[PDB]
Amino acid sequence: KSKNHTAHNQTRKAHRNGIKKPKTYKYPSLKGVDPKFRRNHKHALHGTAKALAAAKK
Amino acid sequence: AISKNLPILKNHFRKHWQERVKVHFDQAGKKVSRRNARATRAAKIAPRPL
Amino acid sequence: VNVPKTRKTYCKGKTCRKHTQHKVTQYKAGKASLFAQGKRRYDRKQSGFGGQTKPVFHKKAKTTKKVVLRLECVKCKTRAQLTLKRCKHFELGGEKKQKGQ
Amino acid sequence: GKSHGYRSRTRYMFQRDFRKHGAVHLSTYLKVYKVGDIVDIKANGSIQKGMPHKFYQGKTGVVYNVTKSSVGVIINKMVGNRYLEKRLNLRVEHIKHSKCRQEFLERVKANAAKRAEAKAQGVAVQLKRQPAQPRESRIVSTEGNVPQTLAPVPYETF
Amino acid sequence: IDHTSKQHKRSGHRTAPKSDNVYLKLLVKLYTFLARRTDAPFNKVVLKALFLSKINRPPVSVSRIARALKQEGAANKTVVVVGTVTDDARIFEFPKTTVAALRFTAGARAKIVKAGGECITLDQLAVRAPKGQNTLILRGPRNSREAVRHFGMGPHKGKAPRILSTGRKFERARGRRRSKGFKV
RNA sequence: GGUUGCGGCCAUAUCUACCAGAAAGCACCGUUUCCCGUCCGAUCAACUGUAGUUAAGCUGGUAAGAGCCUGACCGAGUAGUGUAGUGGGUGACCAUACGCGAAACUCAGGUGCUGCAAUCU
């Protein structure tokens, strides 16, 4: 009695205002990265922070 | 009959509230009545506090 | 299916926190107690005129049931629930095997 | 009803290849993957763990996570009118390196060599690439090449 | 005439204050003049910040001013706030400064005067600094207004639900914990 | 160059038939107390390097060989297909314009190359 599905006009709708890239930040999402690499990486970066806080004289 | 994205409100108006709305126009009219009521009570209770 | 009996699994315990031998039994539910808040609520609402103030499910679709094993550690006596997939027949165990005639 | 299962419509793509059945050759495992390295996605049907969805088969992303038997790849997934940041977890037989990025990363060093050289010499470097230019004026010589006068053919059956 | 973009689209930026304030329009008049003639990048920033609305000129606190002069090299600059300068009773030390605001609060005026400083307007500023010579333009935090914590709510954004009562029984049961159905 | 041990790519390396192999190495080969595994020291285990051996393995070569891998203006700019027309044709379908372009077939060539460590008349 009706019709079921069509992908007609769906491209036109999408392209009118849209198709857009996700912008790519520097320092990306460090989440779902190996937990023990993270656990360490924190202590590495804290170490580098202390080493430049020592260098500042 | 549900929002776009709005807080869920509880507006208690499913009775015949329209039949017992009490608007206080009498505020100013009651205020002078209470002042007159105090003045006359102080004339009655002549030298004593209200 | 055929779950054998007593098996060595992990025990939360608080004392164990390791693989100990738990004695395995099938789970079965107790009694409504007649004093659960949802029973007292129901009995209150059902009392008087009106008659059936709550729904009654009579549209049984599923044949079998999810079988649940009440594993009980032998040292500390603490229990755990493991749910197996839907099975028709259940042997608490069990005439193994015979791993080739 | 209709079928929309995980490995549906994937008869011919997760098929192995003609006379390339059996075992994976060990270079696949000895290959080293690091974060920021651009890698392809192409499943090895013989290996049925950490295998990508048929969507991601053929795609190219960049490694974001590195663990035991597996990497993590970021792929661009257009859905409606906008891309999302789709994070896969792929076993290392389902990926390979992209000579795409290998031929760039050697052109960077070729440019670095050309410029660092021609800074202290006679300079005409033009580091940028140019497309296929309209061909220059040449003289074609007819010395033992006296043109063969071709004619079109009559029709005949077989 | 296959139009690439939307024809007759407005710039989408305020060119005047929707404020009908006489004294703001006299201040806009001065800074539209200076912006045009001076050719100092300061005067374009101040003209736009004058056009900006109440939600986009949030109050810069004295405590935020004191912090912006805590900076090395920028300790003797004139503090250009385009909007309210509010008081902060949190801090105790406040230095001798000159701050050019639209409005001060009775508390902010007291604290800046008592330190020994000069409460300036934008025209009292413009008469001493036509090019904003030795100025420090500050802005209060925009994304701290209570409306902004409901912007782009959905699963699993960690944004505030629009509600009126905040206890249990109010939007914690099903879809906010794995116990009752699922979580977000 | 030979061989071994471990390999990379995984038939130019596999298959079928034959014919060679000095040296060393590999192998076959000898024994059953022990460790060990069998219904059977056959396979697996331990012992010897002695009792014999290139017949097999293994390596190499041969064949208008099978297969495989290459290349070609070979077929073929064919089949097909993107685009275009108030092109044709009753229609089925087809021709032309601007592009992209196979598979079979035919003929010619080829028959593993290479990494590390040790050994070798």
Added chain:
RNA sequence: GGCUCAUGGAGAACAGAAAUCUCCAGUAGAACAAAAGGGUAAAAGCCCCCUUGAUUUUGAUUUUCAGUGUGAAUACAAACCAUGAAAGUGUGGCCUAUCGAUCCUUUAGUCCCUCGGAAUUUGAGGCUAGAGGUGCCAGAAAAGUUACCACAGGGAUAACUGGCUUGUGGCAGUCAAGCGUUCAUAGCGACAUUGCUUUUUGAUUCUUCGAUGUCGGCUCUUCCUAUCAUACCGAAGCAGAAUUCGGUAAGCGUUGGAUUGUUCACCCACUAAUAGGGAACGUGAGCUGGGUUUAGACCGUCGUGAGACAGGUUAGUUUUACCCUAC
């Protein structure tokens, strides 16, 4: 960890197509619980040894997707284990399906919190994870009947016309194996094959549900020709007469009755002949009202029953022109 499977080949008393034994070939032609596809040859298969990773903690990720849920899956991390010489592999089934919210009830966890005037023990309530289920599978608690019927709607959708279609029906060619003593074609015609038509019946749902009066007959006009008769012709298996096949041809006519509401059909009889059709399946402000199809009623079969029947039977209101046009 050992081995190699289907099938075939050559062979060993009873033993043969098939019981067991041995060797040779054997890229999978087997096997892997099922459907199908993919995958797999010192294995994922078959045989043997030990176990319970089918475990605990919660998070991220992929598919479906709103990037919600559910289901399934992935990859880690932190514990504890299994195996193995070890590398390692193991968070159920080689991979793609095998499943389920709130509320309620019940269980597991934890020296937990609460029962608000303050204590204790039952009791109840909570917190974290399961289970009892919704197959209409994002999850109401649910039998008919109306021919006494009703309302809001609908041409989003049927029963009549019309429109595209032409399977079906009807008519008409092409080829001609053959039937017709002989002889394809005087007259017919197999196997095939190309059409035309919209007088059937379908298919469809485009128009109409604030109605286009729904069968047949009576009357009456006009048109079509795919010609029954008549006019004039050609052909013959045309001697005559008679008949048959065609051509021009719609000028001309093409009936009276028995039964049936019937259209259709079937008989009797005359005629030169008793051809086929259309015109909103012509024609109801032209009629008629037998049939159909309101309400009454009877029978049969079905239904516990109300009632049902495109089964049978009987009784059942047919309205208006004085407007415009046409005549």
Added chain:
RNA sequence: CUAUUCUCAAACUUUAAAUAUGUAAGAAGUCCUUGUUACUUAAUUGAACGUGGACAUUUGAAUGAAGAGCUUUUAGUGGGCCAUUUUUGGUAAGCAGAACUGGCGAUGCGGGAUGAACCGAACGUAGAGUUAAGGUGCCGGAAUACACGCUCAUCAGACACCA
């Protein structure tokens, strides 16, 4: 069984397009030293992030860029239909259902006589000029133009979608 042979496959296949499709083409870059770290390494080896230097004319393909990015809020809609090409069911359909694109819906105007969808072109109010599709015997603006042929029909033929 062997070598030949004819013709085939939506749910066969060694081979294998065209069109569509992923990613890259650099300052968040490259090169040279060196710093912490509870991760990993036999290790002083790595891995992630850095310090400090060095290379900006060619800033590391073409073309474009109408400003680029960001957010809030809310209307209507959720019956669609048509056309070339690919395509399923169906004898078929102005039938039913899909794929990409373009249109009508929501669109006037010039043309196909007339027509929602075809062709050409999209539109403020006028002047002038030039053209599109389509035509130029007469209706009817515009050659009863030029040129080479074909056709004579007692049922001529005459412009795509389209009768």
Added chain:
RNA sequence: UGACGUGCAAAUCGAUCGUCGAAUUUGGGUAUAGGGGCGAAAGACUAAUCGAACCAUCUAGUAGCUGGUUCCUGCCGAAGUU
């Protein structure tokens, strides 16, 4: 299946017909009142109203359904899909 059928009439007219000494016709009085009456049974009748009368109220009942929805110009400009 006559007349009339915007009538004499919201059921009449004319002819023809059923019956005509009883289960007959009929006036007045009286009883039965709406999920009730009454029914020699047609869901018939119950004040032109009946498969549940009429009057008022609740009531402006509700309607995913039909219809309507009142000045101009300017700028922007959709959806029939998940």
Added chain:
RNA sequence: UAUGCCGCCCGUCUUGAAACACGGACCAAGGAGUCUAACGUCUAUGCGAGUGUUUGGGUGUAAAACCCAUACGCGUAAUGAAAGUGAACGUAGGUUGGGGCCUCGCAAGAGGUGCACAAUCGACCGAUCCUGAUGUCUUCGGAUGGAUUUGAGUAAGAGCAUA
């Protein structure tokens, strides 16, 4: 008014209306998105770590205007079911950006300081899972330090009232 050409009847539902689809004989007048309680966004106004006089009192040229105390609502603290507990290691952190300003310069530029805001790595509060010091009503207390866990949080306040 004549003349050339053009012009179907509007409103409506609709994929499609001149429609053999619906409403409309004609005219005047009346005739359909209102008010309210409570709220989201955006904007204006006031005051701004506060804010809001008007329930009430005082006052008055009397329903007006003017003045005003104590509360109260909201905000100034979150998170837990709850008993509860409760926001600075540092310049209120580091990193890449970042307008504007400061310095050297003719300018090109380089260097410095960098608000908002954006990404990111941390730190702090509550919850959950452990860790389990000095001690002690010997079962209380929970220091100390961790966790791919978690929150509508902190990190020099933005809100309240009115339109």
